[PDB]
Amino acid sequence: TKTWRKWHVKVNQNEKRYAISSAVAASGVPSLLLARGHRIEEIPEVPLVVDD
């Protein structure tokens, strides 16, 4: 094994931003939160926003 194996992977900036946008949009969907294992059965609202 050599150190100059490729360790890091480049993603296009726009695809990275697409991915984060999708991830934030998914956080607004109660079914996806429950599917991903979050115990959110009792929270009042999704998205959940608290005071400053």
């Binding site: 490729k6 890091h8 992977v9 480049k10 993603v11």
Partner: protein, 200 residues
């Protein structure tokens, strides 16, 4: 003053005066040791312009160096390789004979620092040089801001690393397109190092 006259007269190496003086001095030099101390510069104007000063701590040494090429020192002309490397006779050392003069005087005066050197004479067998040396332990040198730099340990045996005037010439140190091979090994390293970035 006299220095301008000495500079102009030193350019006339074919004149009757300089031819005669060269003959007698070359004979005198051949009578003493290969390396010997000079009481004073034989060329005071040349010595000053190369950094010499007439104060304690500056030393002049004279040395003669055999002229001609470098015969390959292999046993019976036998090189054990390809024909491109079978040459023995018409080969040349990459360092000047002046550089060798500095090297040998520097070993002879291992407490001193080689400052510079200049040609003084030649016959068919030898070239004669005078090597200017400085004592880094002498107080007159250590308190002098114009020569102080040479006390610092980075200047140890600068002649052995090609750092004198003739050493940098033999290394091909220069500016611009004619010296692209530059410091050779460092330049070679820059061109033969594969640069593998974190592409992320």
């Amino acid at each position: 003053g006299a220095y301008k006259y000495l500079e102009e007269l030193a350019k006339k190496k074919q004149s009757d005066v300089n031819l005669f003086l060269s003959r007698v001095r070359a004979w005198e030099y051949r009578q003493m040791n290969v390396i010997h101390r000079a009481s004073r510069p034989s060329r005071p104007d040349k010595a000053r312009r190369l950094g010499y000063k007439a104060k304690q701590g500056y030393v002049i040494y004279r040395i003669r160096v055999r002229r001609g090429g470098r015969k390959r020192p292999v046993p019976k002309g036998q090189t054990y390789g390809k024909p491109v490397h079978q040459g023995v006779n018409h080969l040349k050392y990459q360092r000047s004979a002046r550089c060798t003069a500095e090297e040998r005087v520097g070993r002879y005066c291992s407490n001193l620092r080689v400052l510079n050197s200049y040609w003084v004479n030649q016959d068919a067998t030898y070239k004669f040089f005078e090597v200017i040396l400085v004592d880094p332990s002498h107080k007159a040198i250590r308190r002098d801001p114009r020569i102080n730099w040479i006390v610092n340990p980075v200047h140890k045996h600068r002649e052995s690393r090609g750092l004198t005037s003739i050493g940098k010439k033999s290394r091909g140190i220069g500016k611009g397109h004619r010296y692209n091979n530059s410091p050779q090994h460092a330049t070679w390293l820059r061109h033969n190092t594969l640069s593998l970035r974190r592409y992320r």
